[PDB]
């Protein structure tokens, strides 16, 4: 399946919270919307900073969010590599 | 206790016919700085150094990444986790 | 620093939806007292325990054994290091 | 290929080190004549102790001695559950 950046399941989470919009998300974690609105683009990652207010303000665990990002970061990684990673690292 | 991902790597090394960071940097096919800074815990683990370290040690990826994730998250909570339950306000 | 490999297993099951010993005990099939002592780091790896571990995990059984191996060589020179250092002929 | 015992391999080079015997080797390592046969024997292991005292003597590392160890212990685990443990463990 095709990489699916953590901001995705972000939006979808907030839809669902009555709509909430970046700048309400952004005040509750108490973090620059710009922040919050680079993450909903795709154009930032979830540090673990991040992942530990999400933990807080949505009730999860901040492993929750950080392996949302391990997975996309994977994906595009095997995009970008993957061949070349199978041609270049010696299986022990 | 924050155990950082690079402290793993060098145990497992030492089982290599005591392996340098030089050699494996040639068998991952990076380089050897990178390598030595990973293992001095002055670097962190991504996807792609991932993808390297689950060919040439027989594993996946998740378990090298989920190790830095739980470094990070214990240094975060470290540097900032009485700040960040003080400012986050839990959706319930 | 003396690293049980119970503690690796520890970080790695709380990415597992936070998945509990007994949970593990059943996956693994073996007893809950078992996977609960390897965690509180009270008991060694053996080969058997490695080997569900690396079936479970997507590891080799090597991977962990080295662990314990690490663990215990640091575990033995504490105790008895300076004794062995000084009792013992180099063949040479 | 069938286990190998770690003893099978200290009489090898016992052998090759002037017929050394088991007494010989027990005074170099400082430990009971009992436990030098008994690992000549295939009847004991080798623990992180005696591997220590085993690289002090040969010139090798305690790894090396321990990773014999394991790999005579994974594959008289695989003859003895191996199938068994295919059938239980889940894959994750």
Redesign the interface.
Known sequence: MRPIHPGEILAEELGF?DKMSANQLAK???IPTNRVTAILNGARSI???T???LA????T???FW??LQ?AY??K???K???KK??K?????
């Open positions: 919270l509750h974690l108490a540090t673990a900073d992942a530990l207010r807080k303000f949505f009730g665990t901040p492993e950080l392996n391990d970061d994977i595009m990684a095997l970008k590599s993957g990673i199978e270049e690292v010696t299986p022990y």
